[PDB]
């Protein structure tokens, strides 16, 4: 029953989160190149190791592919990358929402500010 | 330019968050007597310093009060809380809502989407 406490995302997700975002953003396109591992580690001050463990999560779910003598790639698949993002936020939508009607406020009031937020 | 790093939320404001949470929700309610810093350390599983920072936090967002000789209690003035919660969550709400906009998801479709999510029973 003790409260569950949070800990620090791990840095090589974080840097997942970072490139994911620039991909659904289009700061980073279908098949830029991305920088090395070693250029990534020296531009974030971020362990290489921790780079290419980022590397590997962000290729497992295809957000950037390898190809051998050329470099690490923006996957083409780039709108299935965003989708995904979009499915992140909307789960934030749907538990922030869901704490305001917890909180009081009732879902005829969440329609009329959410209005007033989009106005 | 490296990008920031987000470190772990130090305990002491997570206990902060918690409790006014409770307090936001009614789980616990204007004047309620608080547990001594020894008990909230033992119910949590924290060190009794990190509570004792996190009950000294509390008290500087007029959330609980420690009076003298009786002891720590939730404000009076719960619905003041009450209030600024909503604020977080009405911050986080419009920040959920920009940042949809700017994956480029209309804003008359996000309207759609919260009548949706609200629909729900
Ligand atoms: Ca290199």
Redesign the interface.
């Known amino acids: ?3 569950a ?5 791990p ?1 090589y997700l ?2 997942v989160d ?1 490139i994911k975002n620039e991909v ?2 289009d700061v980073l396109s279908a098949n830029d190149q991305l920088p090395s591992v070693r250029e990534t580690a020296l ?3 971020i362990n290489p190791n921790t780079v290419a463990k980022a590397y590997k999560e962000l290729e497992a779910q295809k957000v950037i592919r390898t190809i051998p003598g050329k470099g690490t790639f923006i996957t083409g698949n780039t709108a299935s990358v ?1 989708n995904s ?2 499915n992140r ?2 789960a ?3 538990q ?2 869901a ?7 009732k ?1 005829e009031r ?2 009329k ?3 007033d ?2 106005g």
């Open positions: 029953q003790a409260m406490i949070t800990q620090k995302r840095v974080q840097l970072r659904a953003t531009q974030e001050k965003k993002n979009q936020l909307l934030d939508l749907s922030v929402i704490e305001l009607i917890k909180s009081g406020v879902g969440i329609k500010i959410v209005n937020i989009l």
